Symmetry: D2
Subunit: 264 residues, 4 copies
Amino acid sequence: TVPVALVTGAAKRLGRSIAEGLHAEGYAVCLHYHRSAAEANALSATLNARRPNSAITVQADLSNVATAAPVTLFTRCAELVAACYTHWGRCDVLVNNASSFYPTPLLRREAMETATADLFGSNAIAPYFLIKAFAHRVAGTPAKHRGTNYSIINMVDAMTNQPLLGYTIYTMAKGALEGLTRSAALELAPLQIRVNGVGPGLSVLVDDMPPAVWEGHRSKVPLYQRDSSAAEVSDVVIFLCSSKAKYITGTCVKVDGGYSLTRA
Amino acid sequence: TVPVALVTGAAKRLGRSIAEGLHAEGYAVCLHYHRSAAEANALSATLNARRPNSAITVQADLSNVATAPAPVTLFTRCAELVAACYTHWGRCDVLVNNASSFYPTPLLREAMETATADLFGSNAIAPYFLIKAFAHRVAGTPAKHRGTNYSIINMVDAMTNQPLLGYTIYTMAKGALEGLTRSAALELAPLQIRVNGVGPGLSVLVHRSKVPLYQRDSSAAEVSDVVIFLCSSKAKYITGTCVKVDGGYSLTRA
Amino acid sequence: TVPVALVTGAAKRLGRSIAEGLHAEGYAVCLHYHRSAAEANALSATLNARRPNSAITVQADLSNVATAPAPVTLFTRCAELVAACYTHWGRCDVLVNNASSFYPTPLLRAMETATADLFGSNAIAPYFLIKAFAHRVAGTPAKHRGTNYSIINMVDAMTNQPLLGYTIYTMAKGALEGLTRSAALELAPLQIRVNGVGPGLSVLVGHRSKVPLYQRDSSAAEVSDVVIFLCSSKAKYITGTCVKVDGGYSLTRA
Amino acid sequence: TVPVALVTGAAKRLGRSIAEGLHAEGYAVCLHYHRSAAEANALSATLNARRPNSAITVQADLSNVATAPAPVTLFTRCAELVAACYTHWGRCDVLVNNASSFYPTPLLRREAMETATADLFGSNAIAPYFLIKAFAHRVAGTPAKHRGTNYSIINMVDAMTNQPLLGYTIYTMAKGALEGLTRSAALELAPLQIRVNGVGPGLSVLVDDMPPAVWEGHRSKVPLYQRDSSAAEVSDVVIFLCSSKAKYITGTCVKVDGGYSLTRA
Ligand SMILES: NC(=O)C1=CN([C@@H]2O[C@H](COP(=O)(O)OP(=O)(O)OC[C@H]3O[C@@H](n4cnc5c(N)ncnc54)[C@H](OP(=O)(O)O)[C@@H]3O)[C@@H](O)[C@H]2O)C=CC1
Ligand SMILES: NC(=O)C1=CN([C@@H]2O[C@H](COP(=O)(O)OP(=O)(O)OC[C@H]3O[C@@H](n4cnc5c(N)ncnc54)[C@H](OP(=O)(O)O)[C@@H]3O)[C@@H](O)[C@H]2O)C=CC1
Ligand SMILES: NC(=O)C1=CN([C@@H]2O[C@H](COP(=O)(O)OP(=O)(O)OC[C@H]3O[C@@H](n4cnc5c(N)ncnc54)[C@H](OP(=O)(O)O)[C@@H]3O)[C@@H](O)[C@H]2O)C=CC1
Ligand SMILES: NC(=O)C1=CN([C@@H]2O[C@H](COP(=O)(O)OP(=O)(O)OC[C@H]3O[C@@H](n4cnc5c(N)ncnc54)[C@H](OP(=O)(O)O)[C@@H]3O)[C@@H](O)[C@H]2O)C=CC1
Ligand SMILES: O=C1C[C@H](c2cccc(O)c2)Oc2ccc(O)cc21
Ligand SMILES: O=C1C[C@H](c2cccc(O)c2)Oc2ccc(O)cc21
């Protein structure tokens, strides 16, 4: 009876805020996490206190590596979607929010091979496997039992067309996610599964450098001269998931305060 | 108090849907029309019946020509539209450049100078002047009296990168409008005036089967709700961007 | 047999360099100018001293206004520019829309002049010129047509990251981008290719140090070689595309 | 001073045409191949007979998998391709990322699924990344006074992936990463004067393994000429972007598609 959202990397920051925004609209939310077990369970607790049985947590490394028979990434992704159907009997919304982000400079061991798998798995390959698994489930549901508003959001990046110096794999991974948005929107249109991108510029900018540098980097955003709040992104995601957005598919909405209109 | 929306080409179809959407959020709406006085006045009557003094109508040709009363330029008519809002309600918070002529200007086989003025005016030049007048008024308001949510929406087209055969001047003017959205967003950022695009693909046709999502054109609400969302405070960090509302039509190839 | 190129704003800088490059490939070149009569003529003389009957000059204001004889409209002026190629050499194979005014049209604190000047030269004159060029080609019987028709529109690599205060200009280049796409689709049956070239910083008169490649603006040749390549028979499958020549400048962000 | 070009998937079609067009301009060419040994060796023989010792061949699976010797990583096989150029001719001026696998990965109906991902993503995106890395390291490790004057990297992307081909998601995704690679490497390698550009074909030398009406149906949709392109119609563009006349063009994509991307259903 109640719609279901699967949110990857739901524990903190934009993931938490998306999970909360959907929750506030009456979704039950499956809270995916990798490292951040404590933050995910705290968030689950808060949502379940607000509305009983409105949240669960599931752990998964979305790197394109086999784990713990070794278990593939595809399996782990299928298992994420399956947790939604096991617990609540449905999965209506998928938000591919989880994402690794760190330098892979082109100009100078097993940190190389783990980087590619981590940055590609989380940003691109796992989203592919998630969308596929989400779609198989919809396909397998008799039409009379289908949800009436299936929506998938990929968090891409407003700024990867002006690439961040030294972040090539990340930039390529987000490039791939963009492709996913356009290819899945096309192929899944027959099943009325909408697929769209949301692309933050500077959002909840990590405070881990001198204040002058942090204030320097925010002040470049033309609108407000700051990085966004998490809700300023997440509200956009909740709007794209809503029935008022039911004719939107295959598009990317930039949420960047005009940062992409800038030049050096 | 009550925020105000100026919606051009408000009388019918998407413009009417946008004016209705905005009015449902609590906006007073100034309903611009050109030829559709009957339809624009009936819409005003409906909205004023729902909420007293919540709509007005104003007439202007948005073509890039002079009109008689010294002849009146496009720029002056555009300033007078924005002014009409200020005169009547003391504010103009939202501007929706919706009015648009759309007809063939083929490259292959006099009043081709009519097309230029008409297609280029409504779609690109009048929006530029409207944005300019809009911004002047905000800049002219002492900061402590300014609203908190200035929003300009340009109605562009999802399909203009895959041009409609024979619609060159229309296609060009949409390309001009997209440039207006980016340049205005950047220059108006310091006054907190957001500027975004909404591109319909196929909407309320008066080829439907080619749209990946649903194999139909959209309702007017399917577009105008997106407009309303972009104007709301939840969309306050969005500027300079363009939202396609095309059911995936731009993903297709012949 | 000798093909003909018409180059707008051919007197100096990129226009000159494109005209030279075309000429170097053996084109007869029609050198359009507005105010630079001395430089156009001096260029013509050099190219005529190299090969007789290989260069002419034609004056035209490309602003979207009427001029002195009924008055002469921009359409007539554009058609006559193309007629000059046919009158003198019996053909027009290549059109380069290079002429371009460029100056501030600020949104925040003569408006008619900016509008006519920046839109005409950048967008409407290219439209009329493309239309005249194409009409000629269509009116030539098939057996007598050239085998390599090329239109190049000079656009701007940086207009997605707009220059602050230059709205009408940025809109006009966006209109020209749309002209590239719409004309390439419509003119493909007559095998008229239409492409853009987007210079970034070129032959400046301190943004230069920000260009990732070489930390300088380009030379004129650095751009015009691209234009020559796109007109060559090696580029015969390219149409409706835009080539940035900007040393990676459009890759940057504040 | 004979400049050198590495061309991945050089044995046939567009790769071979690119390897020829570079050879014709005076390049020594290292012709990479995977399963097409015989075609590659044939083309090498042809170009060596025009100009002795101006072609070699190297074999590598560019799939993102470890191979038969410790196992050998994709990263290593990629470094080894750029190495072959230095070992044999002392330089590598031009890299063309052309190798590409292309087949469907439908979202709608499983050692097939693993192998597709590693192959499609390896060939179209991750191999180019490592090739670029290796090519740049060499340039960085060459003392400035000995560096060539015209380094150029071309990635063969696709004019049409913004209008995706139904059922080819991993391919489309890989091409999207490859576009990212162009933009990112152009910016980062700009200080070494290493230009990085994309060339995006539309319908080029279209394989005829459907009924004639299907082939002719496809081709007829191309606005310019109502045909697919020759290999040369793409490779000439590659050659131009590598030439010294293109020395200010970096981080850009050139579509070679006869207007196909302008169309709508
Ligand atoms: N903040 C910003 O300005 C920008 C954000 N974005 C994008 O928006 C989205 C949300 O942004 P933000 O909240 O800042 O993202 P974060 O960087 O905070 O990452 C969110 C989560 O992704 C999860 N994650 C990372 N790697 C893996 C992995 N290998 N497997 C599983 N989970 C993983 C982490 O989970 P856990 O903590 O449980 O380990 C982390 O909490 C991301 O996709 C990001 O790329 C894009 C541009 C700018
Ligand atoms: N519907 C669709 O499928 C699509 C729509 N769009 C865009 O969406 C917007 C709204 O679409 P739609 O509702 O179909 O538009 P319409 O074609 O119905 O036009 C809306 C109004 O614009 C006004 N108008 C036209 N020319 C002039 C002029 N010279 N001066 C002043 N007003 C003028 C007319 O007002 P009046 O009746 O008062 O004279 C008209 O009712 C437009 O900007 C359009 O470009 C884009 C792509 C597809
Ligand atoms: N150089 C650069 O950095 C950049 C250039 N570009 C584009 O590249 C092209 C060439 O650049 P560049 O050589 O610098 O151009 P210029 O600014 O030097 O101008 C070129 C010529 O345009 C002609 N022109 C201007 N206005 C009119 C008018 N109303 N009617 C007729 N002709 C007119 C002038 O002719 P006359 O002198 O005879 O009066 C002028 O010499 C242009 O389209 C430009 O917008 C784009 C981005 C950057
Ligand atoms: N032709 C067209 O219409 C289009 C082409 N393109 C792009 O242009 C480029 C060239 O096109 P085209 O000539 O048709 O290419 P092909 O599809 O013929 O493939 C090119 C070569 O790539 C090699 N290859 C494939 N998978 C691998 C792998 N895992 N490892 C190593 N090598 C591999 C093959 O080498 P071998 O034979 O040695 O095994 C093959 O000969 C490609 O990158 C393609 O994606 C893009 C859009 C349309
Ligand atoms: O009525 C339409 C549909 C029309 C349309 C019709 C058919 C195909 C297509 O891409 C677009 O687009 C319009 C553009 C501007 C406008 O003011 C009205 C319309
Ligand atoms: O001379 C220039 C440089 C100039 C310029 C200067 C500085 C930044 C930038 O993006 C562009 O751009 C032009 C645009 C049109 C034109 O006719 C000439 C120029």
